[PDB]
């Protein structure tokens, strides 16, 4: 078993412009890649858990997501950040795409993506961390039994509720490794 950092994507790793599904619009947040490289060095498995409802909406296709995801994966690996896992939820209850229109267990606040990652990589949850910019990220982490829940200021201004749920509030994923050391 290994400890892990569960990573929310939009607003945590990349700037949230809304329904980002293009390489052209994918901008990595400052210091996040270096921090991810460092987090890995420290010994954490790195797992991305992202809700991608735009797929259900028909904003962008599933294949489009994969193309961005592969690129993201390559860009990181090239920087010596090798991601342990990447999980996503394409569903929404009101989705206009029939294939993806449903209630599901993988859509945060639901803890399914995290549980799925845990069984696959044999992660030790109490030792783990969750970093996100939204309350659902915190809620999924609590459900999943993650030890420390971290909120970040890289999204839209954080709600009091998300803040209530969080264990830590940090400026960026960039500041996580230092935070863990102290």
Catalytic residues: 8, 10
Closest CB 112 distance from Ca ion, rounded Å: 16
Q: Which listed option, Zn ion, Ca ion, none, makes contact with residue 89 (CB within 5 to 8 Å by class)?
A: Zn ion
Q: Does the annotation flag 122 for ligand binding?
A: no
How far apart, in whole angstroms, are the C-alpha atoms of residue 162 and residue 148?
A: 14
**What would the x/- binding string for Ca ion be over residues 111 to 140, using CB under 5 A?**
----------------------x-------
* 52 touches 62 (CB < 8 A): no
Please report where in the chains the tokens 């991608």 appear, as a residue. 52
Tell me if the bond preceding 109 is cis, omega within 30° of 0. yes
Query: Looking at 45, 81, 106, 162, which residue binds Zn ion (CB under 5 A)?
Result: 106
Binding window for Zn ion (CB under 5 A); candidates: 63-71, 84-92, 124-132, 147-155: 84-92
DSSP string across 26-49 = --BPTTHHHHHHHHHHHT-EEEEE
How far apart, in whole angstroms, are the C-alpha atoms of residue 44 and residue 47?
A: 9
Q: Is 78 exposed, middle or buried (0-12, 13-18, 19+ CB in 10 A)?
A: exposed
Nearer to Zn ion, 3 or 109 (CB): 109
Query: Looking at 15, 97, 104, 121, which residue binds Zn ion (CB under 5 A)?
Result: 104
- Does residue 8 belong to the site contacting Ca ion (CB under 5 A)? yes
- Does residue 10 belong to the site contacting Ca ion (CB under 5 A)? yes
Q: Indicate the annotated binding residues for Mg(2+).
A: 8, 10, 133-134
Applying CB under 5 A, the residues found at the interface with Zn ion are 89, 91, 104, 106-107
């Amino acid at each position: 078993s290994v400890p892990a950092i569960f990573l929310d994507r939009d607003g945590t790793i990349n700037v949230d412009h809304g329904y980002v599904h293009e390489i052209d619009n994918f901008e990595f947040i400052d210091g996040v890649i270096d921090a991810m490289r460092e987090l890995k060095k420290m010994g954490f498995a790195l797992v991305v858990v992202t809700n991608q409802s735009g797929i259900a909406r028909g904003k962008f296709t599933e294949a489009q997501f994969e193309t961005l995801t592969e690129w993201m994966d390559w860009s990181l690996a090239d920087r010596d950040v090798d991601l342990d896992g990447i999980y996503y939820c394409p569903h929404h209850p009101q989705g206009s795409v029939e294939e993806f229109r449903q209630v599901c267990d993988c859509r945060k606040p639901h803890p399914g993506m995290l549980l799925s990652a845990r069984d696959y990589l044999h992660i030790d949850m109490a030792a783990s961390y969750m970093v996100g910019d939204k309350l659902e990220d915190m809620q999924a982490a609590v459900a999943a039994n993650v030890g420390t829940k971290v909120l970040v200021r890289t999204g839209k201004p954080i709600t009091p509720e998300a803040e209530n749920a969080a264990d830590w509030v940090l400026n960026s994923l960039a500041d996580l490794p230092q935070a863990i050391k102290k």
